Each structure stands twice: as structure tokens, then as C-alpha cells.
Amino acid sequence: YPIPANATNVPISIPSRNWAAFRGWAFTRLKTKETPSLGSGYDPYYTYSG
Amino acid sequence: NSIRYSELAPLFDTTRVYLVDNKSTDVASLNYQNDHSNFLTTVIQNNDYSPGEASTQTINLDDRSHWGGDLKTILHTNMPNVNEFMFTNKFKARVMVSRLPTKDNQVELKYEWVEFTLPEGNYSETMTIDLMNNAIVEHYLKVGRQNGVLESDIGVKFDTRNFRLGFDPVTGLVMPGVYTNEAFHPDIILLPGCGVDFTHSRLSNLLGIRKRQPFQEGFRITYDDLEGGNIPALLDVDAYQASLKKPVIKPLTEDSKKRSYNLISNDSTFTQYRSWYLAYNYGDPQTGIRSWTLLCTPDVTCGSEQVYWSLPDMMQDPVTFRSTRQISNFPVVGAELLPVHSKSFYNDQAVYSQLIRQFTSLTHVFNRFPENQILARPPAPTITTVSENVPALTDHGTLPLRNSIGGVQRVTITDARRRTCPYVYKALGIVSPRVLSSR
Amino acid sequence: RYVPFHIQVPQKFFAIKNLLLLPGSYTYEWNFRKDVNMVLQSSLGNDLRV
Amino acid sequence: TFEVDPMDEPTLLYVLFEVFDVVRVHRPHRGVIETVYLRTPFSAGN
Amino acid sequence: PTIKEGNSRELMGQQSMPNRPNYIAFRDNFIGLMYYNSTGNMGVLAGQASQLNAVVDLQDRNTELSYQLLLDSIGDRTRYFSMWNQAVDSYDPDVRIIEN
């Protein structure tokens, strides 16, 4: 989920779900500038290489 | 002896095993490299979690049983009449390119083969054959004007107007006027240095010329096999039944258009034009036309060529099939019909083409030869080829299924050739299994 | 720039890793991400494909 | 109810939920594989 | 100093700034070479009899992050090897944190 400029407060909302097990949580940050929502080779969005 | 699904309630008998498309529409990593042809729909429509994420999940036929079912195909692979991916947009044929004074007085016979490109998108019979004439108008000017040939021995010319309903059997040629111009079979003009190659392009089942055996590759009607009775001509379009000479002897050196008309200078009946229709049913068939080629009612697309659709993960192999899963050789589950159902209408916007259809679009690109009266705008039959695209309902046979279905079921479109089809939006498979016998 | 060089290249899925295959008859199918931008790193952050 | 230090560039806050996805490599016949996967804390399994 | 490109006296204050250092080869331990979490064309393992697959990936899944996090236990990922870039992208503690 994207977080842009001048919007520092973004939560997650998911409907009723039947999940059974759970080990815990781990979150960190990724940039849209240095990678897109990838699932293929050919993507014109990727203009960086860092 | 029920089914299995993720953390919900099973049912009793006659339950489902899905191939739904909606969950495959939003995901960025199921279909992003390949098209709808061999994409990855989840077996799963899990409404009790985040949409399109239960990918490792599969609706399972129990380890207890070995069931059997059917496949649903609602296909929308709409292939147009003229495109790069179907055999109508290229043909390799002999055009006259080069003519220049080299030695004393004699003209050298020189020949080359160069590409042809046509506008793609049209469907009509008064437009498919019409823009194959454009291939000529485009060639003999770029290479063949400064270094080559005149508007006389025009090769690779695609016609439709008939020739042997002009031959009035009295002296030889047409006595008062010109060739016939109504509803007849489409055929091709070939001249001293010309020959249209069909099987090189696989243009047999479309234009007008077909094979008895669409198996051999190497087409031959290159002004070699076409022989019997040559193409009628005009003797003197200006003198029969007007002034009295019986002008059957003095023919077509001095008339309406002087391009050294292919009816030889002071001849009786023989014209240099060697075409397809002239000796099929009219004359002697042995080595000529009927033996290797045939006359047929035209179809817009290739017809009904057998397509090899599958949802293979679920049916291990129905009766006689070996498995290799990527996009080279998908295991077949039967023969289906691709949505290219031929439509033919009766109208007369094609018969009347010599006056209206030539002038409607104001350009010199559609046609460049107006009234030479052998090589011009094609006038199609009363019953024309109309490319109509409609989602048609057709399905496979019957076979038993797998023990485990596997995490992802792959919806397959194996079209005309064993590869991807570019133009798709629909790809489904509503499946219902049923009980037979235990293991 | 121009290099003739060869190496054995990876396969990293959990399912495939420490598996001892039984004898018989099998099939093994793969693909590659072809875009130059994503496959190779940059030490300043400058594009290759672009 | 997430809160981060002031944002400047468009960035995706990558959050992992600890899910559980395991296989089992079946071989009833020599050459034939029976496949079954399961991501449980994500409505997936069997 | 000045625009003149052919010949000029006024290129006396013209100096030399070297280009920014940057090197391009394989991403650490062969990462990003093949697709991981990309099932347009999947890493399918089938059989001459077997119809089934071995890859069932999604955008909500990690496979790129796996081969470094689990491999953290089997030695420190710094040791010198040429095939896989077994020494992993690591900043200088002297450079990022300034020792002024």
C-alpha cells in the first residue's frame, strides 16, 4: 500500500478472515521510486537501478 | 464422499472445482508477462479473505476417490480478417523491377523479389482483395520507376471479375465490347515474369484458390500449370457493328488505352494473360487446373480449424495424453471451435463496383489503373465474405480427473497454431465432478 | 562492456531445495526476467535500460 | 493505527504478516508426483 | 569560463572533476536473476505422466527475501566466494556513521 507526501497516517483495513495460526509481525519501508509492483520482466515504470 | 476447501463447510455429491477469472483480474503477479492464453487463474474464489491471494490453495477431490467431470469454455479470441498473426498479410510473388538499355536494341529479362505490405483492419471481399492490389501500386514506383518497368506487364495483380463469360465463341475474342463484370469467382492475372505463391503464405482457403490436398507445400500455377484457352480481349473496341472491314484481324494496337495491350500486335485470339479460371471446368482437365487446385465458395477466415483448449491440471490425461506444462506443448483435452463462424450475406454493393466503389474515397492509393479493362478494382460476387465476431458456445468430451488437482490450474488457449492468441478478455471453466468408483 | 563469461546460475524456492528425486519420467520448465534494469545492480543509482 | 516519521517521497510501507506455507513431496508411482501446498494464516492449504 | 569550443585563451580556469564511481554486475548472491513471486510464466515442475506444478506464487508472498534470512544461520554472509556474491551489500560503518 502506498504512502505519499503530506500523508503521514495510513492504516490497514481487512474484512472478516478465517486465519488460524500466527507467529507475529515484521514491517519496514520500500520505495516506489526504486521498484514498482513487480510480477513480470517488461515494466516501463522501473527507471532506477539502485 | 465429499470435496475439500479452506476452513469452511464441504458439501455431499456433485460439488464444484473452479477456474474463475475475477480473482485473476486484479493481481499483479498472476498475469503480467503472458496474456489470457496461458495465464494463472487461482482454482480459488476465497471470499473469506483478501481478494486474489489464496494461490497455494486448491479445491481438492478427496484422496479417497478418483472422480470425473467436464470443462466449460466461453471463448472470446476474436481474430480479424487482415492481421500480421494470420496468413493474409504477406505474400511473396514475382514482380517486374528492372528495365534499362544495356546493350544494342534487345530488352533484357530481369527479375527480383521484394516485400509487400497492406493496410490491416478491413474485412470485406470488396476490400480484402482490393488492398492486395495496393501491394503493386506501392512497389513499381519506389524501385521500378527510376530503374524499371512500365504500366504494361503488371504482375502480382489480384482480380475478381471473370474472364470466360466474355468469350463469345464466334471468331475468338469479344466482338463488340469488353469482359464480363458481375457475380463470379475471384481469380488472379499472371504475366511474362510473374507467379503468385499461395502455400508460402497459406492463402488457399480464403481468396478463391484452394487445394485438393492442403498438405504439400510448394504452389504451382506460375504461368506454367495454367493452360487451355487464353483470356479474351478486344479486337477493336471502336469498329464491330459501326463502319463497313470485319475488324477481327486488326485488334488492340490502336484503341482506348495504349499500353502495348497484351493482345499481341496484329493477332486473332491469343492474349498474353494467363489466368486461373480460363480452363477449370471449361475445356480439358488433366495437368492444368482441376487436378491440383479447385473452385470453392469463399470463407472470410480459415474456416473451422481445430483448437486445443485445456484446464490440464485437473484432468490427468483424459484418454491419450502426455504432460509438459509450459507454453510449447500443452496436453490436449479434445477439439473445440474457435469463434470465427463464417457469415455471408446477400447484397449488391460488390457487383456494382465499377462506378461507385472506385470513386467514393478520393485518392490514388486504392486504385491507379482506371480503364485499361483487365487490371482494375475488384468487384466481388452477390454473396460476399463478412467477418463477424460473436462469442460461440462449444465444449469438449468426457474423461476422469486427478487425485490432487494442484495449487494452480492453468487456463489454456491453444489457438490456430500452438502458441498464444493476442486478442482475449474471456477465459473460464465452471466444472462439476461426479461419483463413479472407489480406488 | 563486452564479455564472454559463464557461471552456474540459481534456483531458490523452498519446495525445490533439499529434494532427493525418485527415478522415472519428469518435466522441468522455467523462464527468465529479461529487463536489464532489474537484473543488475548500480553503485550510484543509474539506469541501464534507459 | 500506524504512524511514521514525516513523509517526503512516495513510499510503500512493506508490512509482513507471519503466515505459514509448507509442501509435501508425494511419490505413489516412480515418476508421478502428487502436489499439495498450504499457506494457512492466509486462507490457503490442502 | 566561456562558450568557445574550437580555440580560446579563456579556458584557463578549466579544471578536472572525475566521474562518479559506479559498478554494474550481478545483485548479491545471484538475486533477481530469475523470477520470484511472478506467475505469468511460473517455475513449473511437471512430469511425463504428472500434470501438476511446483510454483504457486503471489504478490503477497516472499521468495526473494528468503535466501538471505534463512541463510543467516549457516555462517556469516561475508565470506569470499565468486560464483554467488556471498559477501553481501554492506555499508562502511566509518562512512554512513561519521567518525568526526
Side-chain angles (χ1 to χ4, degrees), chain B residues 274-291:
Chain B
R274 271 163 270 194
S275 294
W276 197 92
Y277 189 81
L278 289 161
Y280 171 77
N281 46 52
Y282 210 104
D284 299 62
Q286 198 198 111
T287 330
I289 292 139
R290 198 182 169 264
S291 189

Side-chain angles (χ1 to χ4, degrees), chain C:
Chain C
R1 296 183 193 183
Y2 302 94
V3 275
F5 79 105
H6 311 116
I7 0 86
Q8 179 178 43
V9 293
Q11 50 178 71
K12 47 207 167 193
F13 277 91
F14 54 94
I16 206 151
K17 270 183 188 184
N18 312 318
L19 182 60
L20 195 80
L21 296 164
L22 219 77
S25 301
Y26 300 92
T27 318
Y28 197 81
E29 309 287 299
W30 285 87
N31 173 75
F32 283 86
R33 282 178 179 166
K34 259 219 170 180
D35 67 311
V36 189
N37 279 340
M38 189 64 78
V39 69
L40 267 65
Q41 264 283 342
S42 291
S43 189
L44 191 79
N46 61 300
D47 40 33
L48 300 142
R49 190 190 180 180
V50 202

Side-chain angles (χ1 to χ4, degrees), chain B residues 123-303:
Chain B
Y123 322 97
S124 314
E125 200 164 283
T126 335
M127 266 136 273
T128 308
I129 322 157
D130 186 38
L131 304 160
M132 289 187 180
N133 175 224
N134 178 56
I136 306 315
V137 195
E138 283 186 14
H139 182 261
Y140 75 87
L141 285 157
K142 55 181 179 181
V143 200
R145 190 190 180 180
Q146 296 160 53
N147 189 32
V149 91
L150 303 161
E151 292 177 299
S152 298
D153 299 293
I154 297 148
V156 195
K157 175 79 196 199
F158 290 82
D159 263 72
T160 307
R161 55 178 176 180
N162 205 252
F163 304 104
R164 211 140 199 174
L165 195 256
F167 198 95
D168 205 295
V170 179
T171 323
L173 313 150
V174 198
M175 307 168 286
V178 212
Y179 305 80
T180 171
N181 223 339
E182 224 179 318
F184 294 105
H185 192 74
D187 301 294
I188 287 163
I189 272 150
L190 303 169
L191 282 160
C194 187
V196 283
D197 211 305
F198 280 94
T199 332
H200 199 95
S201 60
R202 211 167 188 175
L203 208 86
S204 299
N205 302 297
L206 310 154
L207 203 73
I209 307 185
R210 227 170 138 172
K211 271 197 192 195
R212 273 195 169 185
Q213 294 151 41
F215 300 94
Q216 278 193 44
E217 289 183 61
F219 210 89
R220 277 179 187 261
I221 66 154
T222 322
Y223 91 97
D224 215 299
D225 261 357
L226 315 167
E227 207 171 62
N230 286 294
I231 223 134
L234 329 174
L235 348 124
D236 205 275
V237 81
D238 281 300
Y240 199 91
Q241 220 173 327
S243 298
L244 205 146
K245 276 188 174 182
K246 197 177 181 180
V248 290
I249 311 150
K250 202 171 185 178
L252 216 39
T253 325
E254 44 163 60
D255 277 278
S256 60
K257 281 207 168 193
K258 297 170 190 177
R259 297 283 184 183
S260 299
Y261 209 122
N262 283 289
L263 179 62
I264 322 149
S265 299
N266 297 306
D267 269 60
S268 298
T269 184
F270 296 98
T271 317
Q272 209 83 291
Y273 288 101
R274 271 163 270 194
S275 294
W276 197 92
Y277 189 81
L278 289 161
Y280 171 77
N281 46 52
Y282 210 104
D284 299 62
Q286 198 198 111
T287 330
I289 292 139
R290 198 182 169 264
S291 189
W292 196 238
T293 49
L294 286 173
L295 193 142
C296 292
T297 312
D299 293 297
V300 220
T301 48
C302 287

Side-chain angles (χ1 to χ4, degrees), chain B residues 14 28 60 71 90 101 108 158 163 213 282 295 297 383 412:
Chain B
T14 315
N60 196 39
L71 307 185
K90 210 179 177 180
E108 288 284 301
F158 290 82
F163 304 104
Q213 294 151 41
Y282 210 104
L295 193 142
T297 312
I383 298 148
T412 313

Side-chain angles (χ1 to χ4, degrees), chain B residues 2-22:
Chain B
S2 70
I3 71 169
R4 274 180 179 159
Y5 200 71
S6 188
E7 49 213 23
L8 282 160
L11 277 190
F12 293 104
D13 43 313
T14 315
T15 70
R16 287 165 141 180
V17 269
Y18 282 76
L19 275 297
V20 85
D21 195 59
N22 198 251

Side-chain angles (χ1 to χ4, degrees), chain E residues 1-48:
Chain E
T2 332
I3 201 152
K4 285 183 178 181
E5 55 195 60
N7 296 300
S8 57
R9 194 198 178 181
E10 289 176 301
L11 291 166
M12 280 181 174
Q14 197 181 48
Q15 52 218 357
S16 297
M17 181 264 171
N19 297 153
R20 310 287 216 204
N22 56 331
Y23 25 79
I24 299 148
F26 302 117
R27 319 206 161 208
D28 60 341
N29 61 97
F30 275 133
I31 280 163
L33 191 135
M34 305 189 92
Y35 54 92
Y36 301 97
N37 311 298
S38 165
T39 50
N41 16 243
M42 105 208 92
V44 55
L45 199 158
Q48 212 158 337

Side-chain angles (χ1 to χ4, degrees), chain A residues 3-8 29, chain D residues 5-11:
Chain A
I3 295 167
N6 290 302
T8 186
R29 195 180 157 188
Chain D
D5 297 298
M7 203 57 72
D8 303 298
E9 288 173 60
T11 52

